[PDB]
């Protein structure tokens, strides 16, 4: 619940398990994701509780354009002056406020927001000694993006997007035809990443609460988890392949 340091220069400012990660630098900050629209005022408070200025955020990066990752972006952009970075498909869905979702339709809208800088696969941004790089990991949404960070101290952090496919029709899905091929390739791309710090779009996917408690009790390396991303992919792959096999049997 309370915001805290994951690692020097890396802070958790999300609301409950909706991840929002602040990378602080002498040139200003990067924020990855922003919860629900309702999370936005709390994220401002959480950043402030850590002693930072939300107005110092220079970039807001989105993993994927669902209401619980991009919902707070419109307000945080407005208040902070940050430039929003996201893949093309996420930018299109954000412009629609989450509507026309291949699986949800218009069921779960959120405040529309304009992406200022479209991310291409492998594209890098540099700020205050930190490098932020986009890793396209489609499947949960066509534009789903994981983010690779090289910190000023040389540590590598990966913020992995969702690999979940909740209720998704996988066979002849004419709204998102390539989803099976995409997600299987995302599994491989992510599990091979060299990573010191493993984070993800929801706290339960990276052990947020257990690691936070250890960290608060003096385990400085609690978020160093070099095999955690590979474990997350394995857990996701097993569930996905069971899903595809079950749907083939329908
Ligand atoms: Zn989602």
Method: X-ray
**107 C-alpha to ligand 1 centroid (Å):** 13
**125 C-alpha to ligand 1 centroid (Å):** 24
**11 C-alpha to ligand 1 centroid (Å):** 22
**63 C-alpha to ligand 1 centroid (Å):** 9
**211 C-alpha to ligand 1 centroid (Å):** 23
Q: What is the 3-state secondary structure (H, E, C) of the chain?
A: CCCEEEECCEEECCECCECCEEECCCCCEEEECCCCCCHHHHHHHHHHHCCCCHHHEEEEECCCCCCCCCCCHHHHHHHHCCEEEEEHHHHHHHHCCCCCECCCECCCCCCCCCCCEEECCCCEEEECCEEEEEEECCCCCCCCEEEEEECCCCCEEEEECCCCCCCCCCCCCCCCCCHHHHHHHHHHHHHCCCCCEEEECEHHHCCHHHHHHHHHCCCCCCCECCCHHHHHHHHHHHHHHHHHHHHHCC
**140 C-alpha to ligand 1 centroid (Å):** 6
| C-beta of residue 46 within 8 angstroms of C-beta of residue 82 | no
**162 C-alpha to ligand 1 centroid (Å):** 7
Domain-wise residue ranges, the chain: 1-250
**217 C-alpha to ligand 1 centroid (Å):** 32
**113 C-alpha to ligand 1 centroid (Å):** 17
**135 C-alpha to ligand 1 centroid (Å):** 17
Residue 133 in tokens: 């790089």
From the number of C-beta atoms within 10 Å of its C-beta (0-12, 13-18, 19+), residue 204 rates as exposed
- As a CATH number, domain 1-250 is 3.60.15.10
**205 C-alpha to ligand 1 centroid (Å):** 13
Residue 232 in tokens: 């997350």
**68 C-alpha to ligand 1 centroid (Å):** 7
Q: Measured over all CA atoms, what is the biggest interatomic distance in the chain, rounded to whole angstroms?
A: 55
Nearest to 116 by CA among 107, 104, 125: 125
């Amino acid at each position: 619940v309370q915001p805290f340091a994951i690692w020097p220069g890396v802070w958790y400012v999300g609301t409950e398990n909706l991840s929002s990660v602040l990378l602080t630098t002498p040139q200003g900050h990067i924020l990855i994701d922003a919860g629900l629209d309702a999370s936005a005022p709390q994220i401002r408070r959480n950043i402030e509780a850590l002693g930072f200025r939300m107005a110092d955020i220079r970039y807001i990066a989105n993993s994927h354009a669902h209401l619980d990752q991009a919902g707070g972006i419109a307000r945080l952009k407005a208040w902070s002056g940050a430039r929003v970075i996201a893949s093309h498909a996420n930018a299109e869905q954000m412009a629609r406020g989450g509507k026309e979702d291949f699986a949800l339709g218009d069921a779960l809208p959120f405040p529309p927001v304009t992406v200022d800088m479209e991310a291409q696969d492998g594209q890098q941004w540099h700020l205050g000694g930190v490098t932020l790089a986009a890793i396209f990991t489609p499947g949960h949404l066509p534009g789903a993006t994981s983010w690779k960070v090289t910190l000023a101290d040389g540590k590598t952090l990966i913020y992995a997007d969702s690999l979940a496919t909740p209720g998704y029709p996988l066979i002849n899905n004419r709204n998102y035809p390539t989803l099976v091929e995409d997600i299987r390739r995302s599994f491989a791309r992510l599990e091979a990443q060299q990573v010191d710090i493993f984070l993800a779009n929801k706290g339960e996917r990276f052990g947020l609460m257990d690691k936070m408690a250890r960290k608060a009790r003096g385990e400085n390396n609690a978020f160093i988890d070099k095999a955690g991303l590979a474990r997350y992919v394995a857990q996701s792959r097993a569930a996905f392949e069971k899903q595809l096999a079950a749907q083939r049997a329908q």
